[PDB]
Amino acid sequence: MILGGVFXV
Amino acid sequence: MIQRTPKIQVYSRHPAENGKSNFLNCYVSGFHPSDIEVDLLKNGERIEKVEHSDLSFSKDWSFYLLYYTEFTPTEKDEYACRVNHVTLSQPKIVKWDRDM
C-alpha cells in the first residue's frame, strides 16, 4: 500500500 | 545538468538452444536522464513486438530498463540491441553473444 498523503516541495 | 551513460547487456533469459523458445533481453542501466531509445534487431532489422519493464532507478538515482521479446534462436539468425541516449554521440550497437 502506497502513502495516503498530500505533501506539497 | 547530470548525464549518465547507459550500460548495456544483451542476453537470453535461459541458455540459448537452437529451436527452443526463449526470451531475448536488453538490460540498460546506470543512465540519466530517462530519455532513451532501445531497439532489438533480428539480422539488423528492428523487432516490432518488443516490450519493456517499468522505469525504475538505482541507489545513485540512475535509471534501469529491461527490453525483452520472445524468440527462438536458430544457428544463423543474428541478434543485437541498438541504444541511443543523450550521452551517446551515435546509436550504439551491442551484439548478442550466445556462447559466453
Binding site: 502513502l3 498530500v6 505533501f7 516541495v9 | 545538468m1 538490460y27 530517462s34 517499468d54 559466453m100
Partner: protein, 275 residues
C-alpha cells in the same frame, strides 16, 4: 531473512509537451506487484504480481486514487523546483521519489526511508530517526523548513512504522511462495581461448533470488579484483537474476583460479575451479 517494501516514483516535465510523465512502481524485496503509468490506457494502479492480482476492487480503487494524488503532487513539484533554481520553462526536468520500510527476520519494523532527488542528484532525505531531514543545497532548505513547519516527517513516520510494515507482512504471507523463497544460483564456468596464450574464464550465477549476490575470482587464494570483469546484476525476466564475473588467464594457469559465490540461498560459499 529480512524483507522490505519500497515505492519508486519518477516525474519528468514535458515543456509544451503535455503533462509531465509520471511512473510509479512498487516492490517487495526484488519483486514487483504494482505499477502506474500516466501514458498507460487504464489510469489505474495495475497488478504486476500474481499474489496481488486478486486483492479486491476496494484495494485497487484505493491504490489508484492515492497514486493519482502522488502524480498531481509531483507535477506541482516540477514547477516549484523550476522556481527554486530559476530554470527556464523550455527544458525537461526530473523528480525522483523513493520510500519504504525494512523489516528484520522477525518481520518487525527495522527502518524506514524517504528520499527525493531532482535532476538525478540528492535533494532531500528523511534521516534514520524519521524525525529530521537532510537538505542537499540552498533550495532544499526551504523545503526542509516547509516540511518541518507542516510536520511532514511525523505523518511519514506513521506510515513507515504502521501501514508500510503492516501491508508488507500481508503481502509476504499472501505471496509466500514467491516472496519467501530463496533460489540459490545455478552456477557454471565457461572457457574461451582469447589467443594461443590467453583464455577467458567466466563464472556464471543464474536463476537466483533475491538479487544480492557476490561473485569473486581468486588466484592462489588472492582476490583478483582489479583484473575481474563484473557485470551489473540483471533481471532474467521471470523474477530471477543473473550475474557473471570474468578474468583473463594465461593458458596453462586455469587451475590457479577459483570463483567464489555467496548468496543467501546457499548453505555455504561456493568455490568453483576450472578442472
Amino acid at each position: 531473512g529480512s524483507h522490505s517494501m519500497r515505492y519508486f516514483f519518477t516525474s519528468v516535465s514535458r515543456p509544451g509537451r503535455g503533462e509531465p510523465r509520471f511512473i510509479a512502481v512498487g516492490y517487495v524485496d526484488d519483486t514487483q506487484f504494482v505499477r502506474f503509468d500516466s501514458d498507460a490506457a487504464s489510469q489505474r494502479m495495475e497488478p504486476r504480481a500474481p499474489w496481488i492480482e486478486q486483492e479486491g476492487p476496494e484495494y485497487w480503487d484505493g491504490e489508484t486514487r492515492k497514486v493519482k494524488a502522488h502524480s498531481q503532487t509531483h507535477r506541482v513539484d516540477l514547477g516549484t523546483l523550476r522556481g527554486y533554481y530559476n530554470q527556464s520553462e523550455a527544458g525537461s526536468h526530473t523528480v525522483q521519489r523513493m520510500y519504504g520500510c525494512d523489516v528484520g527476520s522477525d518481520w518487525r519494523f527495522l527502518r524506514g526511508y524517504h528520499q527525493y532527488a531532482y535532476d538525478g542528484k540528492d535533494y532531500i532525505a528523511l534521516k534514520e530517526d524519521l524525525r529530521s531531514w537532510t537538505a542537499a543545497d540552498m533550495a532544499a532548505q526551504t523545503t526542509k523548513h516547509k516540511w518541518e513547519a507542516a510536520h511532514v516527517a511525523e505523518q511519514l513516520r506513521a506510515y513507515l512504522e504502521g501501514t508500510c510494515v503492516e501491508w508488507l507482512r500481508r503481502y509476504l504471507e499472501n505471496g509466500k511462495e514467491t516472496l519467501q523463497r530463496t533460489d540459490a544460483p545455478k552456477t557454471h564456468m565457461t572457457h574461451h581461448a582469447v589467443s594461443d596464450h590467453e583464455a577467458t574464464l567466466r563464472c556464471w550465477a543464474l536463476s537466483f533470488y533475491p538479487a544480492e549476490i557476490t561473485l569473486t575470482w581468486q588466484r592462489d587464494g588472492e582476490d583478483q579484483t582489479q583484473d575481474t570483469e563484473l557485470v551489473e546484476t540483471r533481471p532474467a525476466g521471470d523474477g530471477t537474476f543473473q550475474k557473471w564475473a570474468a578474468v583473463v588467464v594465461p593458458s596453462g594457469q586455469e587451475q590457479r583460479y577459483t570463483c567464489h559465490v555467496q548468496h543467501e540461498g546457499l548453505p555455504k560459499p561456493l568455490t568453483l575451479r576450472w578442472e
